[PDB]
Amino acid sequence: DMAATEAFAGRFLDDMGGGMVSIMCALGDQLGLFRALAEQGPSGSADLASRTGLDERYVREWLLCLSSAGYVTVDPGDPDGGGADRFTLPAEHAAVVAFEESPFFMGGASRLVPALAAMSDALVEAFRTGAGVPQERYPAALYRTMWQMSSSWLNTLLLPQWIPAIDGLAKRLESGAPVAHVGSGGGRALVLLAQAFPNCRCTGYDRLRLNVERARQEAADAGVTDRVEIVEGDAERLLPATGDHALVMCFDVLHDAPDPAAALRAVRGALAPDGVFLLLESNGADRPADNSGSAAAMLYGASVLYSVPASRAAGGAALGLMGLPPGKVRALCAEAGLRSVKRLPSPTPLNALYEIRP
Amino acid sequence: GLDMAATEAFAGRFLDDMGGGMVSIMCALGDQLGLFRALAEQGPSGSADLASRTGLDERYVREWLLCLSSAGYVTVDPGDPDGGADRFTLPAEHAAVVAFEESPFFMGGASRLVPALAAMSDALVEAFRTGAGVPQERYPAALYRTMWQMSSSWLNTLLLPQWIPAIDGLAKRLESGAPVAHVGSGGGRALVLLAQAFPNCRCTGYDRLRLNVERARQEAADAGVTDRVEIVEGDAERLLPATGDHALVMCFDVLHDAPDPAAALRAVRGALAPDGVFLLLESNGADRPADNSGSAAAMLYGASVLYSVPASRAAGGAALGLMGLPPGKVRALCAEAGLRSVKRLPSPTPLNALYEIRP
Lengths: 358, 359
What we know:
The structure is a homodimer. By secondary structure, chain A is of the alpha/beta class. The first copy, chain A, folds into two domains: 2-99, Winged helix-like DNA-binding domain superfamily/Winged helix DNA-binding domain (Arc Repressor Mutant, subunit A), CATH 1.10.10.10; 116-357, Vaccinia Virus protein VP39 (Rossmann fold, 3-Layer(aba) Sandwich). Chain A is 51% helix and 14% strand. In chain A, the strands form two sheets. In chain A, strands 5-4-3-6-7-9-8 form a seven-stranded mixed sheet, with helices on both faces. A two-stranded antiparallel ribbon of chain A has the order 1-2. At the A-B interface, helix 1, helix 4, helix 5, helix 6 and helix 7 of A face helix 1, helix 4, helix 5, helix 6 and helix 7 of B. It is classed as biosynthetic protein. The entry lists the keywords Enediyne, Tiancimycin, Natural Product, biosynthetic protein. The assembly is dimeric. Crystal structure of apo TnmJ.
């Protein structure tokens, strides 16, 4: 009872502290401070500020937040009269917060906390009115963060690991066939594939204009506009049933579709008989109430702030970010005629990755 | 190479912290919408019943409940043996923290510090690059409203019921009547409480932020005590008179922001009666900043980056920050200013240290 009250008060404080540390990590990533400290090595606040051209007093207070949190270590100085306090980012921590090239990189994701916190007033209203919150109302920082994080694990995983891991896929892509990306987002996946497999006709589908034009610009900057087309709209309606796609990708967006079953039917119509549907969705329990832990809590909070309101505003099914766990993916795929559902090693414990075939 | 187990462990801590951020945003939303108090008072409830009782939409309330049940803040008894629907419970031990402002354990309103200060991220990116401050007036009103909310809760629990009776001789001196001052009077609740309880006292608040000045005046007017409560806009170091007759001077969570803390303490010493009391609330960290450790220190340093330091710089202050006056520094500054008796009292939070200070 009293022990339980004090224990919970501690958990509450820990979570508020985690919120503040998340905001500090997002600031640090935007400012380049984690990469700066990793490359510099053990550093005082003055030397880290000088290296980045930033203000030492602010950098110092930021460092002290992170040394209190154990994200960096500190060797106190000699205020008697190694000089100043010296801070180090451990290599194991830099793999997570500093180096995009690390398969462990998550640093940019911390910006989801401030970017979605900005929508608190909008959700206070929406909880009352029952309306959705259109995608265009969210901060640009949200979509920039989504592109940043997608680019990092796509660069690490798509060509080095996923495509080679899937039987016969690389050979079919080299020969050339249609490739589709449902929810093409920032467009990096299609640029990677178009450069590596120039005989494929690549098409992205996205409902958000900002994403459509970003992906087009990315293709243009890479010189692959002749290989990469972007379509604005809902792939369930626009993905053609030509039975010839060697690959259809769908990362973190099927759960927002207005009619997931309809979307899978469209995927099944597009795929070649030996084509591959590569699906990334959240992990979690088949029964929502059985979910437990930090990953589920994080994802449900993001679901409240973005996935559910934005999908409602588009009149969608609003299943939310946790709305397609493995059992539901398997049931929906069986219904749609996608009979082979296999898990692949996931980029995060947050997600489940599937190789799906007709 | 990399130690994989330590990398995976740190990745876990990072995810735990992002989850804490999301849960904090959900708690702030829930407090604003009254969902915790509704769930506590109604008892075990489905999402539909809770939404209907609060005038809200079931789909949104459901996703909010699932966040909190995943986090273990509420418990859930699943339904569907076809108890039909899932039923959620806020344990009484948890309601004491997040639902009831009357509880001494209440912290629910504080969660709104996370979204309110997150909104200042873009401003701090610029400030890191230019060295400029960020004036207090740039912050969301929700920040100051949250400060008033949380101050009101522990002042109502502690000031008259616990602190004043604990301070030897103070109640009797206030009953007879003497000047009372509040450095950083904020929302004005402390001065209203004392003016109601001890009407022979002349109470004066000092605050540099106009929003606080006018709120404190309105609170006094609403309570019928304007005749006893004056609010002064500006810095108490310059404006607090040296009349040697104040029975009580209060300063809660703001001395560390002053441009010259020693000067501010010197002004307090001049105002106090010889048996007058300076009641000081400050943060409870290490004497050496780099020795700080743990979630409380991390939370406070993050708020210090986002608010305490930039807002004090914008006013040309010393910008010591939220952790800048730990006990060793309080005691050193007090000894220098002639405040010889420094005693700790039981603090409202683990975050803070509370002092009874006398000349």
